[PDB]
């Protein structure tokens, strides 16, 4: 958690210095951490987005109306 906190405080500064965004390399430079570790933290940083999220801008679908179960070996293969 504390590492994430560092990330975002620095993000503000870097966006203002560059006039744009922070690439993992440039970010990794300023932190003196291994790029792999940075990228890992960036991914882990994603919060739970809701399964019930109305994917339909028109209240069409509760995200669930997409999700398929790949566990199920297909009736093709079961035969």
């Amino acid at each position: 958690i504390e590492t994430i906190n560092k990330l975002n405080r620095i993000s503000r500064q870097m966006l203002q210095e560059m006039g744009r965004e922070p690439t993992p390399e440039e970010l990794a430079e300023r932190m003196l951490m291994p790029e792999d570790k940075i990228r890992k933290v960036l991914k882990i940083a994603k919060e739970p987005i809701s399964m019930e999220t109305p994917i339909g801008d028109d209240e069409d679908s509760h995200l669930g109306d997409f999700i398929e179960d790949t566990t199920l070996e297909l009736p093709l293969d079961s035969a």
Partner: peptide, 18 residues
């Protein structure tokens, strides 16, 4: 005929996309 099914209800999905 046969393809991917829905997660919770296990019903066939919607659309040409799925």
């Amino acid at each position: 005929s046969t393809g991917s099914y829905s997660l919770v209800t296990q019903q066939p999905l919607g659309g040409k996309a799925q």
